Amino acid sequence: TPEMPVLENRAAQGDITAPGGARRLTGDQTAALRDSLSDKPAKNIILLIGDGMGDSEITAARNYAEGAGGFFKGIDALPLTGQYTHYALNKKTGKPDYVTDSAASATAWSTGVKTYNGALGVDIHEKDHPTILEMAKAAGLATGNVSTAELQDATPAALVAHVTSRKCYGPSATSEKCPGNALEKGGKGSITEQLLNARADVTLGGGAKTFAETATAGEWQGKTLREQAQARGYQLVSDAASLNSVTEANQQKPLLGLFADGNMPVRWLGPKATYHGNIDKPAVTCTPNPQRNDSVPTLAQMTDKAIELLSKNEKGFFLQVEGASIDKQDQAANPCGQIGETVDLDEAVQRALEFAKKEGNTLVIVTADHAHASQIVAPDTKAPGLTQALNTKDGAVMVMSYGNSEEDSQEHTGSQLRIAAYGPHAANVVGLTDQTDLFYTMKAALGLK
Amino acid sequence: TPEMPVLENRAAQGDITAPGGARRLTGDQTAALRDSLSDKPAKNIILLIGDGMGDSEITAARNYAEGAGGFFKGIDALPLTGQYTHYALNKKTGKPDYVTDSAASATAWSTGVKTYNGALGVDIHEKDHPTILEMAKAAGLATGNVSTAELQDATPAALVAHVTSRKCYGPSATSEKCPGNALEKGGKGSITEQLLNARADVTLGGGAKTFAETATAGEWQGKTLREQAQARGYQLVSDAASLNSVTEANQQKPLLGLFADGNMPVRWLGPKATYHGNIDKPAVTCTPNPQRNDSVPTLAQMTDKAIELLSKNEKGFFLQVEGASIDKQDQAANPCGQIGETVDLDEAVQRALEFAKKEGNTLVIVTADHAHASQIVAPDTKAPGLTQALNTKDGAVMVMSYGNSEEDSQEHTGSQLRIAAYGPHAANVVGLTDQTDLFYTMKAALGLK
Ligand SMILES: [Mg+2]
Ligand SMILES: [Mg+2]
Ligand SMILES: [Zn+2]
Ligand SMILES: [Zn+2]
Ligand SMILES: [Zn+2]
Ligand SMILES: [Zn+2]
Numbered sequence: 034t035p036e037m038p039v040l041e042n043r044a045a046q047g048d049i050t051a052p053g054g055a056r057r058l059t060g061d062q063t064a065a066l067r068d069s070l071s072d073k074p075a076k077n078i079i080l081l082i083g084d085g086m087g088d089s090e091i092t093a094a095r096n097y098a099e100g101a102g103g104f105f106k107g108i109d110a111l112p113l114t115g116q117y118t119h120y121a122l123n124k125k126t127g128k129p130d131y132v133t134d135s136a137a138s139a140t141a142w143s144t145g146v147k148t149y150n151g152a153l154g155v156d157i158h159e160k161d162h163p164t165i166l167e168m169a170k171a172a173g174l175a176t177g178n179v180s181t182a183e184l185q186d187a188t189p190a191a192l193v194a195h196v197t198s199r200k201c202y203g204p205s206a207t208s209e210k211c212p213g214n215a216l217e218k219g220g221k222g223s224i225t226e227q228l229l230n231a232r233a234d235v236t237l238g239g240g241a242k243t244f245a246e247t248a249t250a251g252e253w254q255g256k257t258l259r260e261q262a263q264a265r266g267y268q269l270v271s272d273a274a275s276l277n278s279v280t281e282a283n284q285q286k287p288l289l290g291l292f293a294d295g296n297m298p299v300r301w302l303g304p305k306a307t308y309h310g311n312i313d314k315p316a317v318t319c320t321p322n323p324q325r326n327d328s329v330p331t332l333a334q335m336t337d338k339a340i341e342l343l344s345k346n347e348k349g350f351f352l353q354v355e356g357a358s359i360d361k362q363d364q365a366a367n368p369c370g371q372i373g374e375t376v377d378l379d380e381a382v383q384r385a386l387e388f389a390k391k392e393g394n395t396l397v398i399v400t401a402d403h404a405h406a407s408q409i410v411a412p413d414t415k416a417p418g419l420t421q422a423l424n425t426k427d428g429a430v431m432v433m434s435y436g437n438s439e440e441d442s443q444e445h446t447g448s449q450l451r452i453a454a455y456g457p458h459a460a461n462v463v464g465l466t467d468q469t470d471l472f473y474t475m476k477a478a479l480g481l482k
Numbered sequence: 483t484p485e486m487p488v489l490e491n492r493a494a495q496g497d498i499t500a501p502g503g504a505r506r507l508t509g510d511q512t513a514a515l516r517d518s519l520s521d522k523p524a525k526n527i528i529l530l531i532g533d534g535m536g537d538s539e540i541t542a543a544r545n546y547a548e549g550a551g552g553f554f555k556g557i558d559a560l561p562l563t564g565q566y567t568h569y570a571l572n573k574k575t576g577k578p579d580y581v582t583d584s585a586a587s588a589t590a591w592s593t594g595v596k597t598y599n600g601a602l603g604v605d606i607h608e609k610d611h612p613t614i615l616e617m618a619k620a621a622g623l624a625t626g627n628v629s630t631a632e633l634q635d636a637t638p639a640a641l642v643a644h645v646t647s648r649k650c651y652g653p654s655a656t657s658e659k660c661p662g663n664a665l666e667k668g669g670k671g672s673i674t675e676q677l678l679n680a681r682a683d684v685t686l687g688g689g690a691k692t693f694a695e696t697a698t699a700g701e702w703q704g705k706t707l708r709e710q711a712q713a714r715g716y717q718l719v720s721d722a723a724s725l726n727s728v729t730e731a732n733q734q735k736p737l738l739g740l741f742a743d744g745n746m747p748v749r750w751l752g753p754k755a756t757y758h759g760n761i762d763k764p765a766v767t768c769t770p771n772p773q774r775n776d777s778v779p780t781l782a783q784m785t786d787k788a789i790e791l792l793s794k795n796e797k798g799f800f801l802q803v804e805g806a807s808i809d810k811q812d813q814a815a816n817p818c819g820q821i822g823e824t825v826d827l828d829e830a831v832q833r834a835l836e837f838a839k840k841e842g843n844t845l846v847i848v849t850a851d852h853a854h855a856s857q858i859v860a861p862d863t864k865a866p867g868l869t870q871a872l873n874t875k876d877g878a879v880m881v882m883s884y885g886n887s888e889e890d891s892q893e894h895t896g897s898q899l900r901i902a903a904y905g906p907h908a909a910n911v912v913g914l915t916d917q918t919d920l921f922y923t924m925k926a927a928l929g930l931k
Pocket of ligand 5: 534584809
């Protein structure tokens with residue numbers, strides 16, 4: 034009988050110093066693999082995104098948190114793996130732009146068309162194109178948009194919004210930065226306002242600050258975005274205790290949890306990498322962030338509730354879970370913050386895999402939007418940028434380096450990265466593919482049309 | 483009827499600026515993938531190694547040489563893809579050392595045991611472990627070691643030598659650096675001397691300078707290694723014309739092609755990346771190296787002759803082909819040298835695939851020993867290191883950055899990287915695995931004892 038399996042253990046089998054003791058497999062894969070291939074329809078889809086989580090970011094967090102011959106119960110457990118390209122286009126010339134930002138890349142997987150960096154839901158001609166979420170809804174599936182960033186940030190926003198610039202978070206930014214989108218200029222509106230329009234059953238993340246602006250035009254003009262929200266029938270939740278009370282999230286009782294002003298809190302603290310830090314300074318060991326909270330639902334927590342609330346919908350559902358801050362810490366050149374965010378995501382992947390595993394008609398996908406700056410280097414390295422030596426779980430040190438930007442932020446990079454899936458149609462991620470392929474893969478598995 | 487396919491075309495299907503025009507797939511993969519799964523015995527094995535070829539290196543060369551939405555006929559054509567870790571061990575503590583060198587990495591895939599950086603065919607206790615090459619010979623299969631580096635370099639040497647240090651190239655380096663291996667101290671010998679002893683049917687590379695040293699002890703002492711070679715029955719070939727004349731390679735007429743003093747010549751010329759090169763200097767366009775030659779066999783040429791010569795062996799064969807200078811140009815901070823060497827290996831993968839495709843019982847594998855330094859960044863980047871702007875195939879510029887070493891050489895890095903295969907047992911690379919797994923995978927597909 035055909036049951037699709039999760040790689041349960043890819044950890045180094047024994048004594049890493051002894052022959053074959055560092056092997057990760059116990060026997061031939063053929064059958065296991067031939068047992069995880071199915072073309073049946075996907076009833077639901079859970080797309081987990083580690084912002085900036087390339088293979089470097091994955092390897093680095095593993096070494097610290099699980100040891101080199103370790104294994105990530107979530108991230109590393111998806112059996113079907115590939116590599117996908119994420120280049121953008123230069124708005125002016127339609128020619129590839131090798132390093133994408135999180136806006137253009139999101140647009141690609143959510144709409145199938147490529148775009149200029151900074152765009153959301155529009156192509157180089159600034160023409161809207163419907164997002165997979167919008168399509169799930171029209172079809173009648175339940176829909177979830179969950180993140181650890183502000184909900185107006187590129188990754189989550191790209192599901193609900195179509196503006197010419199990611200910066201048009203709300204009423205004012207928009208008027209000035211996206212006039213042709215500005216309500217009063219008769220546009221569809223700012224990102225937050227377009228978010229309120231799209232009505233996803235479950236929307237959870239930070240970014241409450243912006244909801245405190247008021248409309249310049251339209252029916253709810255003169256009153257805040259926070260107001261219109263409840264006035265439009267939204268059920269709002271600010272802490273975890275209340276998040277749990279929620280027993281229904283639907284088109285009449287749609288949930289909107291704003292758990293932080295800007296970005297929800299990072300899991301681990303640690304200092305910034307610094308010029309010659311692996312030599313001048315002593316090895317660091319990450320420290321859990323005391324202010325991350327009992328009142329703040331973890332990502333894992335948000336994902337579980339969402340899958341629970343979205344599972345009651347008979348027809349099936351679409352959920353996009355985003356571990357936001359990996360990218361934000363990485364450009365920040367903070368190993369500890371970076372790593373903490375990846376483990377943090379490992380939990381969300383796990384919750385997701387636990388459900389699909391039983392449900393049986395769930396395609397779970399884990400990937401990133403683009404690659405980033407961090408590199409794992411030798412302990413004795415003399416580098417041009419910011420480095421830092423960390424004490425890993427092996428009790429050996431690891432040196433992380435960020436050296437592609439003299440400015441404040443460490444730069445995104447452009448290499449192809451890991452794309453992994455599990456479930457009906459996961460075959461479609463194996464081998465080399467393009468980020469726009471993800472959109473088409475998700476539309477067919479769902480039979481969306 | 484069960485025929486295993488090669489991804490024919492994962493090129494951007496259409497107008498990269500139009501909806502779904504940038505997709506790489508044309509339909510559902512499930513069946514193609516089901517069709518490429520087989521646990522039959524591998525009759526032969528071809529192991530293509532891109533030194534330092536991580537995903538960044540792969541993505542970069544494609545962008546330049548094929549276009550962003552391009553597709554590499556060899557490298558990207560392998561249907562089953564995975565990611566594998568290559569950490570080394572600290573000799574002293576047996577703990578993991580996250581950034582491996584080319585010697586310790588090679589040791590792993592060729593013997594199954596982890597080892598300290600700089601080691602070749604011995605573990606941290608310095609005890610020898612038999613290489614996959616030695617076992618293929620012992621079992622009766624034909625065997626080849628083809629590279630574009632010096633045959634005493636780590637990658638090719640790891641197949642036939644067991645020395646406590648990669649530096650013990652020949653008679654004298656060894657005496658002073660691997661005394662316990664030195665012939666006169668009663669050891670097995672230098673790397674070159676051990677190579678002449680292993681006697682693979684076909685060995686082709688550069689590194690002819692070392693063959694001009696003499697033995698200090700032993701039967702052929704006092705005479706050069708070049709001499710010992712022909713006296714030991716090796717048929718030597720120095721150029722491409724004579725390489726071709728060769729209609730036989732076997733244990734009595736074993737082939738030794740030494741095509742260059744040091745490392746054979748690089749495919750393309752271009753200047754070094756430099757501090758603020760993408761701003762200060764103009765975009766670069768690679769130029770083919772006129773000193774490459776009509777007399778110097780390409781890597782694709784060596785591979786073809788080897789498969790040819792090794793196919794005569796009824797029983798099957800083991801061939802390891804190395805695209806050597808990728809890693810060498812990379813640390814050199816030379817985008818063009820780097821990118822050419824990848825292109826160069828793409829042709830060798832294609833020959834391999836062409837054969838494997840028709841023979842029908844060949845497992846083709848393509849991977850790297852470790853990730854490297856180069857990163858693809860934004861054109862406007864201000865970086866601490868060495869950078870350069872290249873005019874790609876798309877007629878748009880791409881910026882390459884190397885910023886993990888102030889020293890002369892850019893450092894290897896440690897994230898997991900692509901591993902891809904084709905053929906019987908190719909399943910065993912899909913997912914996350916360790917480099918030592920490749921050995922056990924190759925062992926079993928060959929049935930090796
Ligand atoms: Mg994001
Ligand atoms: Mg090499
Ligand atoms: Zn991003
Ligand atoms: Zn970013
Ligand atoms: Zn190497
Ligand atoms: Zn190297």
